[PDB]
Symmetry: C3
Subunit: 317 residues, 3 copies
Amino acid sequence: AKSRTIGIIGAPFSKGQPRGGVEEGPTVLRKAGLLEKLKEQECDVKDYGDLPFADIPNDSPFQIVKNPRSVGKASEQLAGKVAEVKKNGRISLVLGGDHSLAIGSISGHARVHPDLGVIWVDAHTDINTPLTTTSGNLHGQPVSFLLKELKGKIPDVPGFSWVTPCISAKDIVYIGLRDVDPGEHYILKTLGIKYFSMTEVDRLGIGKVMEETLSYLLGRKKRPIHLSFDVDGLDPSFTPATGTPVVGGLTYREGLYITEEIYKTGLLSGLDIMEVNPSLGKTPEEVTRTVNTAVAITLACFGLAREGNHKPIDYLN
Amino acid sequence: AKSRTIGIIGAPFSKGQPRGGVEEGPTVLRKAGLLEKLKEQECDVKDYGDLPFADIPNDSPFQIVKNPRSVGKASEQLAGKVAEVKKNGRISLVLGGDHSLAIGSISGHARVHPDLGVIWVDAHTDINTPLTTTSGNLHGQPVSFLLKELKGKIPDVPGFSWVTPCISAKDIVYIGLRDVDPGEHYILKTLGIKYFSMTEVDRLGIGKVMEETLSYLLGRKKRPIHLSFDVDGLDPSFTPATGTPVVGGLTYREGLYITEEIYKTGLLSGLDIMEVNPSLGKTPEEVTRTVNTAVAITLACFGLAREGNHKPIDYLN
Amino acid sequence: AKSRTIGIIGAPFSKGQPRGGVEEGPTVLRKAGLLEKLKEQECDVKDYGDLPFADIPNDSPFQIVKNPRSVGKASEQLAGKVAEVKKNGRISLVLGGDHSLAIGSISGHARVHPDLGVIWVDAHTDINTPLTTTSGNLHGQPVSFLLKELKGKIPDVPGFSWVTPCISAKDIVYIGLRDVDPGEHYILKTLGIKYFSMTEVDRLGIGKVMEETLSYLLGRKKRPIHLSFDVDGLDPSFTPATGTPVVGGLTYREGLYITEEIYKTGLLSGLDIMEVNPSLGKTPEEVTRTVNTAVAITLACFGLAREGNHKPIDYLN
Ligand SMILES: [Mn+2]
Ligand SMILES: [Mn+2]
Ligand SMILES: [Mn+2]
């Protein structure tokens, strides 16, 4: 179908984070059989292979932003690849990685479909600017490089000179926020970004949360959706092997429901599975659980419904 | 009362499953004190004792259906016993076992009350026909022998010659579906069976799910209810010692709420607690947790409310 | 602000319980940095220090009520201290302890604000009278000494001669009830106490539960709220190190939502964090989890929202 016509892009990149290890995100997400599982449902999966990220040996912090040139060039490469897989009419399934790659994954996707609406599922806002950041990491600042409303509040970071901010403030919906810094929250409330923090999810139920999300994005006009999932968005009992797990988050069922409701719109046009960190699993079972949850989320984005799926044939024969 | 007038039927039967072990379901559910706990609330529990299932030594598969004569005769015996305990005006609490016994547990119950409405709480549809099945087990095909709409799609399986399909397609409500085969889902969607998969539960909330279930069954006309519970319907964190646990299912609170809302209708007229498998608990604590959850579900079906219960006496004396 | 102007009162008291150990509740809740964490948000925390409870050496049971003089005098001392911290215009954050101290914590708070409305978050009703009790503990009977409707049903217990019942039956709302004795439930239903047992929470969603709670208390007239939290109210997976954990209770998110909705009314005027028992943690991780959950609940009562908090300054500078 026009949906579930996947183009998979590896992104074994971790330099946008503190001392990392998420670069073996694609390796585990694939060795857990993601392509082999996406082919049972009628998906035209094309593996564009793990991106070769050229090395930046001498790459010094900008002011506090750790290793900005590496992240900037990695995201430019990813954006080029994502534009390549979107010109083929596919769904750019960028499985990474860290959100420092979301800058590329959305900037490339917006080169083709300028009017995409982003659904950001993350425990964090990931909206620090290079000025208001505190840890000086770039996994925590991918949205600030994308919002049109933050132009002028984003310094000319080295390596991010190619970034033209693409999404408006009114084209992004946060789901699952439960760990927001004061600067992130000031930016979030000033720009009028629609967000469904954990409190709004508890108040409304995930069903009403997703109904409002889709009526807010796809209400005025049907547009592509770029679900930029982050596995720390789900509760740590389900995804323990992630960078910064925050307790009391979306359950497994709620994550699956988010993805199923996004799929059923049929407008999904890009997906990111970020922050799978198999090095932070206390036990190999924790890594297996995180990877299985990420795989289940990914599959549900592409038609695998919990009620069960059947091919359009007469099974009573 | 006319409700909570229980007639307990053991069903230590496991041959409807792959290599089994659920036959010690009644043993553990009783040794965990089910009768002794059902007598504190005003319940007229009568133990009809574990059914003696005669042995079928030479019992070969039909086409792929494993050991069909054993299951067919065991379910005929159970149906006879259930009709016996329903002619006494009781509530046939058939604690088993596996759903291969649901054929008997509902066919016998329908001999007395022809218009029962079945509420099937299972992670699975359990609706394969002997033709559309893949594992060739009978624990996965009890509904297909009961639906009137599948007559002609059910081969003359040996040992199930007594089965007259009793429930319509519009008298069964699935709750908790999260693992449905393509054939099961085709049957489910073609017959128009009302089902509340895990997605509908997440969308609506268990409160609205049970309200719609009871308004669908008991809306047109008050009828007996046959809650055919399956402990894999609850999340594996609560019932790990079951046959085929599927992650991301009904929580403990949701299962208790289902049973409490069924009880408060006062129309419960049959209950099955199936698929308790104390041999698949990794640790004895897992078996204890599964059995305690099954016991709590069973008790809540018979008046034990979470808000607390009091006898109709003046406690301030 | 007028809210989050905390006055912290220790209450290292455990004699209202069976063989205890909750007296090191304040010690752990503080050593886990409660004051140091309440000062980041704009809170004017004043530590009134752990109460010195004078010893009662010869203190014999009344009829079945264990050690009544100790509890009565401890609660009188606590009520005096709470009136002291409420005359300073603060929020009496009494972190204990056991609910045997709720008699003092609410009687003192009602000396100042006679019209407070109590929101009782506990798995238990804690409403036994010294006559209808079965264990003869006083941690299970603090509400019965407070309700005006139980005058005459409360014997002249030694040490509780100072207790004038202060709250009506229509000024208390239970949230999270899932373990109620027959006598407690008779009292609960006779007095017409508004309660949201676990069943009502499952039916309504915690959002609707808190909306009804606040529309019931603060609907007719704005009044102070005395959230008397009890960590056994949350599910044992989140607070295992408590006195009598009851499985299938409020989740972490639901507890945080209760506290956030109470705070956002801005009428919170007293808070109790009771029944933290670091001696019943099977492992030190269990104690750490219980204490972290209690601390998170406490913080959320005083402005720490999950969406994130920012000081009223321009963070984009
Ligand atoms: Mn994140
Ligand atoms: Mn099942
Ligand atoms: Mn309690």
